[PDB]
Amino acid sequence: TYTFDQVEKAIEQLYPDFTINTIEISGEGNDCIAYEINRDFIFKFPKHSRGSTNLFNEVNILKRIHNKLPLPIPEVVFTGMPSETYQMSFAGFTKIKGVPLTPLLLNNLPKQSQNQAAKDLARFLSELHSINISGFKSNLVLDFREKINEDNKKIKKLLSRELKGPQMKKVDDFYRDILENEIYFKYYPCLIHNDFSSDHILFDTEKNTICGIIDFGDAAISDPDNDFISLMEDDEEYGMEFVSKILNHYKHKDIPTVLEKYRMKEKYWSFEKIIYGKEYGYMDWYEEGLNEIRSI
Ligand SMILES: NC[C@H]1O[C@H](O[C@H]2[C@H](O)[C@@H](O[C@H]3O[C@H](CO)[C@@H](O)[C@H](N)[C@H]3O)[C@H](N)C[C@@H]2N)[C@H](O)[C@@H](O)[C@@H]1O
Ligand SMILES: O=c1c(O)c(-c2ccc(O)c(O)c2)oc2cc(O)cc(O)c12
Ligand SMILES: [Cl-]
Numbered sequence: 684t685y686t687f688d689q690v691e692k693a694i695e696q697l698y699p700d701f702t703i704n705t706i707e708i709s710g711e712g713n714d715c716i717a718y719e720i721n722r723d724f725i726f727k728f729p730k731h732s733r734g735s736t737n738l739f740n741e742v743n744i745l746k747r748i749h750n751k752l753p754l755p756i757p758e759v760v761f762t763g764m765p766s767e768t769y770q771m772s773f774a775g776f777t778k779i780k781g782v783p784l785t786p787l788l789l790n791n792l793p794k795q796s797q798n799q800a801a802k803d804l805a806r807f808l809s810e811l812h813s814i815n816i817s818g819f820k821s822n823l824v825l826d827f828r829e830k831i832n833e834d835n836k837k838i839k840k841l842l843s844r845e846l847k848g849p850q851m852k853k854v855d856d857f858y859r860d861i862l863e864n865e866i867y868f869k870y871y872p873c874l875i876h877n878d879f880s881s882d883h884i885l886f887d888t889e890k891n892t893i894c895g896i897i898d899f900g901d902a903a904i905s906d907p908d909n910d911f912i913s914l915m916e917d918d919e920e921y922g923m924e925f926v927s928k929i930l931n932h933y934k935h936k937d938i939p940t941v942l943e944k945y946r947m948k949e950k951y952w953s954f955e956k957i958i959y960g961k962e963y964g965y966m967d968w969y970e971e972g973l974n975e976i977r978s979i
Contacts, residue, residue, distance in 0.1 A: 737900035781885035805932030
């Protein structure tokens, strides 16, 4: 964690001409804390080394796709420096004014506004997924089969003395079932947002139109279907019906596939909670995942 004195000092070092008048905490994620500075900029500071690589990733991707997208995205204006601890010490982005398009907010909109929102997200995704990926930096590729095998290995290392025989057999089976299913690894890899959820979609209540996409730190080259299944959850997201509208504008050509990927992903969450948990020292996510795994 950081003091305001630390943030200001960090920025002053690299941007001595930049006058800081105001600084307040803007937000906080698992990877970075955000500061709003002079009410003009969002500055992200990594909470840890791992978070710093997401920050570093966001900056590189945003630089590459700048003015290629049909909706406003953060623009990099300030960058920090690498250390032995952080790949990037901080970054300052233009602030995009607006509020998040919550499930609540969306469902209260004129049926036309909802439909237009679905159209704007579709064409945003269409152009993003169309961006030319050759000449893209290292690390950017996220091969799904590589991910699952690596995860499987991790679950095995973590849970071998935590599960009983029948319970681990269930784990093996699930991972077996995933890996022997071609549709998961068959996609054309494209540049994807990879955390495309309602809290990263900023909305203009005056125009009743989406006015920005934020938080590219998870972006990668992978399965573009990821950017639909993330919006499709019923608890914290928009739901299968609204995403379906988005799918039509996208001109999507295998929607049951999208659906099959959604359901697999929802089941898979227990395992991510174990892994993401253990890695981020979230003993709460680990125990939840562990308890879920010891069940249905
Ligand atoms: N909270 C409970 C929910 O958790 C996940 O969904 C949420 C994601 O976790 C969020 O993203 C954060 O966590 C990810 C790792 O999980 C990170 O990669 C990402 N950078 C983070 O911003 C995203 N913004 C919203 C989405 N609804 C599960 O899928 C969902 O079933 C479950 O109900
Ligand atoms: O410009 C930004 C902005 O406005 C918001 C934002 C976030 C949550 C809110 O509830 C809100 O009202 C605004 O955050 C961002 C996060 C970024 O990574 C980059 C940005 O540029 C902004
Ligand atoms: Cl300067």
